[PDB]
Ligand SMILES: CCCCCCCCCCCC
């Protein structure tokens with residue numbers, strides 16, 4: 001089924017700081033496909049609004065350059081589910097976080113997958129944390145994932161992990 005899991009007691013102020021998209025998966029190969037694929041987003045930093053929203057700073061090569069983006073994940077009465085806003089009010093879900101090393105999150109539509117779902121495994125260091133990746137895969141046995149990208153240290157310290 002669909003993001004059957006979340007974080008109990010998400011101290012959104014403690015996910016503040018810099019993050020490395022260490023790995024990312026999706027329900028549809030086209031999502032993570034090519035380099036320009038829509039949801040091949042590289043998370044730079046999570047900025048929690050004092051009100052309690054979530055400002056995400058991400059990079060995404062659009063026209064031909066590693067472009068830097070910035071979207072705002074607003075708060076809901078569920079502590080660990082945030083909305084973004086487009087023509088299609090997708091939402092962000094934070095599966096799990098130990099606050100210092102890893103943060104597993106997912107972002108979901110509203111209109112079913114197969115159609116839309118993408119989860120990432122964020123680490124704070126540009127290392128390869130096998131155990132974060134184990135918690136990733138564990139958390140995503142449950143899910144309709146069809147593609148799974150994984151990056152290397154060298155790659156992490158580049159823009160759009162080139
Ligand atoms: C703009 C396309 C959706 C990108 C949203 C990713 C935001 C990262 C969320 C991190 C949650 C802790």
Ligand SMILES: [Cl-]
Pocket residue numbers: 076077
């Ligand atoms: Cl509400």
